[PDB]
Ligand binder design. Structure first.
Ligand SMILES: Nc1nc2c(ncn2[C@@H]2O[C@H](COP(=O)(O)OP(=O)(O)OP(=O)(O)O)[C@@H](O)[C@H]2O)c(=O)[nH]1
Ligand SMILES: [Mg+2]
Lengths: 127, 14, 86, 360, 405, 283, 98
RNA sequence: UUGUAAUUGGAAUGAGUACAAUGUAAAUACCUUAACGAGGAACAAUUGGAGGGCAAGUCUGGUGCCAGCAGCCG
């Protein structure tokens, strides 16, 4: 009830100001003129700043999702550019694969004569 | 069946 | 409150069938489309397209019935004690 | 009594606009000085098509054939078959039906028969990907043109089915004051009774012109062979530049003659597409007449469309003048505030038209 | 409606009611608001403030009084704006349908004080009762004298040819050797990092902005679109020059206008009673057409007698009132349209009749007697109904039974 | 064998295939033809691969004396053993036994389909759809995401299939990337295989294996031979060279302490490029 | 819930709206004429001895009213004033009744 | 000896109307009360629910002549 939404917050700006002050004191743990006078720029700045800070609409659902999606998309585009550069530098360094032994052999750890003849013939062909 | 529900028609005097 | 979208059973051959008494209504609060009962086909005559219908809780799956049309009781019309203002 | 027009100019438009307005019209002095005066065969066939899809309409053709009296009835539609004379392709007769289809008592289900392409009239792919989307923008949710059989000139033999399920009271009000950003280029390269090589060479031809571009280019290869391929050899392409952002499409098309080089045609159509996008602001020249007409028959509100200073040519002026003669509506044009381009905004007030034929 | 206000008047003094409750009534009318009615907001209508015949008396004497007259009617427009161009079809109740020969706006004869203050304020920058009875391109298109070709050359063939005119292939090729000049249209696909960020923001807006781009209720959403469109209309009109504005929107409601009609029956001019109002109402294209009207009709509850087939009955459709011979029918379980002899005693029935067509959902009432002589004491509202369809033909059928032994 | 009986899911599959009227469809596992008749309805022509001659005969009987009879073509054989014609869209409810190989064949078709709708076992579908850092991220995920993009269409229940199987099912969409990325299949597969023996351990641990070191040493010797530079070929000649190359590349790429399951495409690509820089070629 | 209704478009112009049509309808002799005279005096401070046809009067700073006395003996009038009357003042003889 | 009456007899009476008085600051009303005020006592009690029956009538289905739906419409 202290900070509940009001029908017209603009009509009671001063009231809302008090609430902010109270919050600033109540939640400080978590964060860490005489009108009765015969004769009466910075004050205009005070008006502007106080009224603006007092009233800032909380960003909406769709705005949340738009921000997250913008971040994901833009990071994706950067990743695409980096991928393209790396793949170009890969085409710079390229060779054939027929002679190179596949990593599929990692489990074997021991070899028959038949492949040994195959390897022996292969290395002979290479020279 | 073409003529059942018609009221206009082409009048060609050529 | 709702908006009458289409009278689904108006073409049904069997008079006073359950289908004949079903009307598709758009709930104006959320725009969700729903189906509602009318007490009888005689009452179905009063309901026509694009009118205000007040719906109340009641062919399984249809859980609403029309109680007022255009701000007038359907029963009042059916007893012929009022005229629907257009 | 009758609004009078002169000559065969804008025959289909003047008839169609008469249908939508419900105002009787007279067209006189049709090819009076020609050796063969009066209406052509396809124009008469077009009038027959109008009679088939309407009820209560009365049409008179003069003894000499040079004068027409037309009194519109109500659009009723239905299921029918139309035999299109060889003098014109199917697109000639389909195009006016697109104007009238959404506003009928019953759905349009018309089976057209005849030649399916020509050098001067809207093609099948032009309709499917070039005009019908504009209708979808205007609220025609469901509309389809099915190609049962392709018929190339001169013997034709093609069959297409037009179905427009969407029946709507009137077109939605347009508010398009920006230049759409076109995202990709697509197209269809089709051929009949000939080897697949021509289509590939054609798609190859378009690709060179468009390869310098910064967007995707993927052209479908629809080779037709066998019983459904028609009676004559033929081949043509339609290229469409699509803007997924707001569902706008810019397209160019043309067909090849015997002895012509497939690569050259692909290059020419690609260049023509680059022409249309250069000249266009929100819609292409070939789509503008449909866009303008639908706005006139919208609700009594101001619709806005951005058009380039290139679209204001002879055809645009006569279209507006015919609209004013029938509908008394005046299209107002204002400059855009931008200095980068010299586009203008066409603001049109709708007439409050409503589809009264449909049952409720 | 239940709870409706009802004012009470006691007596009459000096031909005037007591002042006290007159104030109450006046205040109630002042603060009252009006609902939007479907028929009023789709047609232009006008109540005649004054009636005047412009016919030259020389014509009246040479040809005689029987000659048809030309008449001018002045009044405030209501409802939708009336188109400025002449030739508009309108219907005057009890007279018939006519065409607007001329139309022009006049200064308001009874300006409201707020309006007069603004005009006086305008003068600085540079009566309460009114009872008379008691080379810009845009112009070039619309000057038909200039040919379209002449128009084009000044400020710089036909629609049968769907393909738009294109330059020759070779010159087009040379024009498009490079893709420049159109790069803006196509999507693009330590300090420069921010420059990169901006382009990707623009692309993201272009790629997915719409899906992202709220009112609590669906109703308010509908109203917002209507209000937004209305706001756009006002903005375009406010930018718009007053004369050209009148040419587009026409004469808006509240404008005091002069309308001149030709070929009016002379009986209207001679047999004019200021007590009886003269109501002018615009007609939509469907209103002009005549044909078969299919409607759901029922005998009015307070009417003593049921109606009969092929019995004259006066209808009230739209602006027009007319007598026809309706045929009452039944759906026969939605199989065939079977003619009835009389309307159902306490239920609707399909009614078919010939007359001017009208849009579906146009309500109407029915009356059998309009003359005071035959009024009697019974209720005169005979039938009520809603028009269901408009058509040029209908297939009513009757049961014929052949008998043998 | 299990047969689907829910019409709605079949309708959804054929609809989300989005078959253009000028498309040819490779429809694997035609079954009774419930999918096939619809696909024939909205397709230029359909090529079908059937294992059972009887079942294809039933299909022919069903489609015989119909307007779509001329469009259908049936191939009899083993889907893998057969050499296939060009096709634009692939729609299959094939037995999952050939599920994993099938995908790669579609990926390795000379002209790959633009879109394919494939039904798989739930766990397999999730592994295909798994993203970097997910529990089920595996070699299959990285490989397919190199050669395609996979998305989820539906979760298909047990009750829909009769007799009910012992696992759930799902329908996914595969889109092969055109143009294909210009990275060797063999090198990528070799790197991933060496790194994904235990995906939740450090990559350095993956390279610490003796067999991996032997394979990398032999490949380095082969690469030197191809470059015409002489090589000794003894068993332990370059062990001290390959080990230090691996340590330097792993340290510089900063990928030594990052688990395989939490590494994305670009990290693996950087590792591959650095290994090619220092001279080690995997497969 | 009672707040929500069908959306419709109100075509009343935003500026210089026309006077509202007020129809004074009732059986003969109920006092339609005297009622019009009474109201006209209140808003304008002048008395109209004799009234025929529409009478437009100022009722406020930015409001105007047009009063029309429907012929009590004519049904045809009752139809078309009912078509154009924005407000209807139903004169009812209390002593006699409806 | 049960049920049904636009059958029939003369007795009573207030809703309402109304002299008067009472009541009230002045009035309305209540309690009183001259005089009127009842047979369809038309001086015209309602709101819901349940169940029938009728045709040269209508629709749907079929181991004939039937069944279902329903029937302000013959
Ligand atoms: N005693 C009494 N007389 C009234 C009242 N209202 C009207 N009258 C009288 O009824 C008579 C008719 O008054 P009008 O103003 O002419 O009524 P109207 O509606 O114009 O009647 P018509 O124009 O003839 O149709 C006058 O003599 C009035 O004095 C009322 O409340 N009490
Ligand atoms: Mg009077």
């Amino acid at each position: 009830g202290t900070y509940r939404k009001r029908f017209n917050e603009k009509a009671r700006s001063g009231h809302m100001a008090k609430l902010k002050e109270l919050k600033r004191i109540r939640n400080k743990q978590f964060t860490r003129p005489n009108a009765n006078a015969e004769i009466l720029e910075e004050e205009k700045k005070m008006k502007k700043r106080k009224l603006q800070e007092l009233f800032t609409p909380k960003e909406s659902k769709v705005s949340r999702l738009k921000k997250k999606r913008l971040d994901k998309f833009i990071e994706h585009q950067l990743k695409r550019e980096e991928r393209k550069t790396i793949i170009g530098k890969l085409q710079d360094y390229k060779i054939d694969t027929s002679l190179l032994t596949s990593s599929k052999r990692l489990g074997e750890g021991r070899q028959t004569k038949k492949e040994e003849f195959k390897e022996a013939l292969s290395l002979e062909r290479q020279g | 069946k073409m003529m059942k529900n018609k009221r206009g028609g082409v009048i060609d005097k050529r | 409150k709702g908006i009458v979208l289409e009278k689904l059973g108006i073409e049904s051959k069997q008079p006073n069938s359950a289908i004949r008494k079903c009307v598709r209504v758009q709930l104006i609060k959320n725009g969700k489309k729903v189906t509602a009962f009318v007490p009888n086909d005689g009452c179905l005559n009063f309901v026509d397209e694009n009118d205000e219908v007040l719906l109340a809780g009641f062919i399984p799956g249809v859980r609403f019935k029309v109680v007022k049309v255009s701000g007038v009781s359907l029963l009042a019309l059916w007893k012929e004690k009022k005229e629907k203002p257009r | 009594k009758y609004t009078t027009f002169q000559g065969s100019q804008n025959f289909r438009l003047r008839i169609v606009l008469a249908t939508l307005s419900g105002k009787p019209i007279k067209i006189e002095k049709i090819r009076s000085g020609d050796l063969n005066p009066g209406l052509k065969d396809y124009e008469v066939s077009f009038l027959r098509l109008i009679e088939s899809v309407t009820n209560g309409s009365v049409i008179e053709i003069s003894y000499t054939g040079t004068t027409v009296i037309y009194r519109p009835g109500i659009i009723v539609g239905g299921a029918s078959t139309h035999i299109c004379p060889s003098s014109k392709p199917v697109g000639y007769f389909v195009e006016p039906m697109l104007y009238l289809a959404p506003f009928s008592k019953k759905k349009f289900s018309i089976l057209f028969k005849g030649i399916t392409a020509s050098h001067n009239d809207a093609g099948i792919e032009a309709i499917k990907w070039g005009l019908m989307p504009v209708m979808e923008k205007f609220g025609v949710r469901e509309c389809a043109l099915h190609t049962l059989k392709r018929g190339s000139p001169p013997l034709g033999g093609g069959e297409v089915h037009l179905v427009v399920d969407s029946l709507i009271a009137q077109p939605i009000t347009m508010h398009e004051i920006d230049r759409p950003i076109i995202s990709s280029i697509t197209g269809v390269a089709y051929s009949t009774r000939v080897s697949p090589s021509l289509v590939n060479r054609m798609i190859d031809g378009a690709k060179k012109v468009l390869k310098n571009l910064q967007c995707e280019v993927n052209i479908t290869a629809d080779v037709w062979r066998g019983e459904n391929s028609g009676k004559s050899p033929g081949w043509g392409i339609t290229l469409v530049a699509q803007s997924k952002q707001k569902g706008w499409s810019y397209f160019a098309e043309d067909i090849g003659d015997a002895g012509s080089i497939p690569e050259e045609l692909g290059e020419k159509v690609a260049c023509q597409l680059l022409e249309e996008i250069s000249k266009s602001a929100a819609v292409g020249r070939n789509q503008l007449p449909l866009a303008i007409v639908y706005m006139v028959i919208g609700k009594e509100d101001i619709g806005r469309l951005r058009i380039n200073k290139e679209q204001i040519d002879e055809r645009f002026i006569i279209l507006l003048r015919d609209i004013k003669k029938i509908f008394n509506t005046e299209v107002f044009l204002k400059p855009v505030d931008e200095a980068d381009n010299e586009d203008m905004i066409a603001t049109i007030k709708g007439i409050g038209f409503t589809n009264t034929s449909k049952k409720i | 409606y239940q709870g409706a206000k009802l004012f009470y008047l006691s007596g009459v003094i000096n031909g005037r009611y007591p002042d006290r409750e007159i104030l109450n009534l006046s205040r109630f009318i002042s603060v009252m608001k009006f609902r939007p009615l479907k028929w009023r907001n789709e047609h232009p209508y006008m109540l005649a403030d004054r009636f005047t015949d412009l016919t030259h008396p020389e014509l009246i004497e040479t040809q005689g009084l029987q000659i048809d007259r030309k008449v001018a009617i002045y009044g405030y427009l209501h409802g939708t704006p009336l188109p400025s161009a002449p030739g508009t079809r309108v219907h005057i109740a009890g007279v018939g349908d006519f065409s607007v020969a001329q139309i022009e706006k006049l200064p308001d004869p009874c300006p409201t004080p707020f309006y007069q203050q603004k005009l006086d304020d305008f003068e600085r920058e540079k009566k309460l009762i009114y009872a008379p009875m008691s080379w810009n391109i845009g112009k070039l298109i619309y000057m038909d004298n200039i040919s379209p070709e002449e128009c084009i050359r000044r400020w710089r063939v036909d629609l049968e040819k769907f393909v738009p005119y294109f330059d020759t292939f070779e010159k087009l090729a040379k024009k498009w050797k490079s893709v420049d000049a159109i790069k803006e249209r196509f999507l693009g696909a330590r300090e420069m990092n921010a420059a990169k960020k901006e382009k990707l923001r623009a692309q993201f807006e272009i790629e997915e902005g719409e899906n992202f781009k709220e009112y609590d209720t669906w109703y308010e959403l509908q109203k917002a679109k209507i209000s937004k469109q209305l706001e756009i209309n006002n903005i375009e009109y406010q930018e718009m020059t007053p004369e050209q504005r009148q040419r587009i929107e026409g004469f808006k409601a509240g404008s005091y206008v002069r309308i001149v009609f030709e070929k009016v029956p002379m009986e209207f001019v001679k047999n004019f009673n200021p007590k009886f109002p003269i109501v002018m109402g615009g007609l939509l294209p469907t209103e002009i057409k005549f044909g078969i009207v299919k409607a759901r009709l029922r005998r009015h509850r307070w009417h003593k007698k049921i109606l009969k087939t092929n019995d004259p009955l006066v209808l009230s459709l739209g602006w027009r009132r007319f007598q026809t011979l309706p045929i009452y029918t039944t759906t026969d379980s939605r199989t065939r349209t079977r003619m009835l002899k009389y309307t159902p005693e306490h239920t609707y029935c399909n009614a078919a009749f010939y007359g001017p067509l009208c849009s579906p959902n146009t309500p109407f009432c029915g009356v059998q007697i309009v003359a005071n002589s035959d009024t009697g004491n019974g209720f005169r509202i005979a039938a009520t109904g809603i028009v269901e369809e408009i058509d040029v033909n209908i297939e009513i059928v009757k049961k014929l039974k052949l008998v043998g032994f | 064998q299990h047969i689907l009986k829910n019409p709605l899911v079949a309708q959804g599959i054929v609809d989300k295939a989005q078959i253009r009227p000028s498309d040819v469809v490779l429809e694997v596992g035609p079954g009774t033809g419930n999918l096939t008749v619809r696909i024939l309805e909205q397709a230029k022509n359909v090529v079908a691969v059937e294992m059972d001659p009887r079942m294809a005969a039933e299909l022919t009987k069903r489609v015989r004396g119909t307007p779509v009879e001329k469009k259908l073509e049936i191939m009899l054989g083993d889907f893998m053993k057969t050499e296939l014609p060009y096709f634009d869209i692939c729609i299959s409810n094939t037995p999952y036994q050939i599920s994993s190989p099938l995908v790669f064949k579609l990926i390795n078709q000379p002209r790959p389909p633009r879109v394919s709708i494939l039904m798989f076992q739930r766990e397999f579908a999730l592994r295909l759809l798994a993203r970097p850092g997910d529990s089920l991220y595996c070699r299959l995920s990285a490989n397919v995401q190199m050669w395609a993009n996979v998305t989820h269409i539906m979760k298909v229940g047990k009750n829909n299939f009769r007799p009910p199987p012992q696992v759930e099912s799902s329908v996914v969409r595969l889109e092969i990337k055109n143009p294909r990325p210009q990275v060797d299949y063999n090198e990528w597969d070799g790197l991933l295989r060496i790194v994904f023996v235990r995906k939740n351990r450090t990559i350095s641990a993956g390279f610490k294996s003796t067999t991996v070191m032997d394979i990398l040493e032999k490949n380095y010797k082969t690469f030197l031979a191809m470059n015409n530079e002489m090589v000794d070929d003894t068993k332990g000649s370059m062990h001290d060279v390959v080990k230090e190359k691996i340590d330097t590349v792993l340290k510089e790429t900063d990928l030594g302490d990052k688990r395989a399951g939490k590494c994305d495409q670009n990290d693996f690509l950087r590792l591959l490029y650095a290994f090619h820089q220092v001279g080690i070629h995997f497969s | 819930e009672r707040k929500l209704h069908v959306p419709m478009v109100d075509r009343t112009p935003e500026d210089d709206p026309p006077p509202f049509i007020v129809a004074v309808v009732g059986p003969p002799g109920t006092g339609k004429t005297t009622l019009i005279r009474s109201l006209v005096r209140r808003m304008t401070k002048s008395t109209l001895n004799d009234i025929q046809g529409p009478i437009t009067v100022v009722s406020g700073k930015h409001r105007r009213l047009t009063f029309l006395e429907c012929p009590a003996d004519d049904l045809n009038a009752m139809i078309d004033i009912a078509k154009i009357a924005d407000l209807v003042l139903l004169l009812i003889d209390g002593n006699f009744g409806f």
